[PDB]
Amino acid sequence: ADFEVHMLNKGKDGAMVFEPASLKVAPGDTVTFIPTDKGHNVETIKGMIPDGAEAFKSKINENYKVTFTAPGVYGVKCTPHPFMVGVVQVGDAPANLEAVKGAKNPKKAQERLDAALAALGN
Ligand SMILES: [Cl-]
Ligand SMILES: [Cu+2]
Numbered sequence: 515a516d517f518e519v520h521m522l523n524k525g526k527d528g529a530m531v532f533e534p535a536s537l538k539v540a541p542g543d544t545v546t547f548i549p550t551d552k553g554h555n556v557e558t559i560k561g562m563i564p565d566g567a568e569a570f571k572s573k574i575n576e577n578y579k580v581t582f583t584a585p586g587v588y589g590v591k592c593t594p595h596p597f598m599v600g601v602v603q604v605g606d607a608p609a610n611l612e613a614v615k616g617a618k619n620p621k622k623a624q625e626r627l628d629a630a631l632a633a634l635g636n
Pocket of ligand 2: 521530531553554555592593594595598
């Protein structure tokens with residue numbers, strides 16, 4: 515299956531956001547990150563992806579597609595916007611949950627990550 519995540523200045527969930535900011539996918543599914551507004555990108559957060567997964571980074575304004583196969587949670591961020599974060603999860607019972615959950619990001623960013631993990635049923 516293929517999914518889209520849009521990058522927005524303001525969305526359903528607030529300002530500088532990925533929409534949706536949480537997505538549960540099956541191994542082999544893809545996500546394309548699509549700028550709806552100018553000035554955003556996506557990159558994996560250091561330490562916040564599964565073993566077996568590769569880090570990634572897009573260019574500002576780039577439509578950027580990633581295939582997710584390794585099970586677990588994937589923390590993503592937009593480089594210029596400190597609170598603009600999200601989580602993609604592959605499968606159930608992610609093994610690296612604490613890499614995201616126990617992290618020490620700015621409160622607004624961390625709340626967004628934590629709410630994403632909670633919405634994913636963790
Ligand atoms: Cl593009
Ligand atoms: Cu952004």
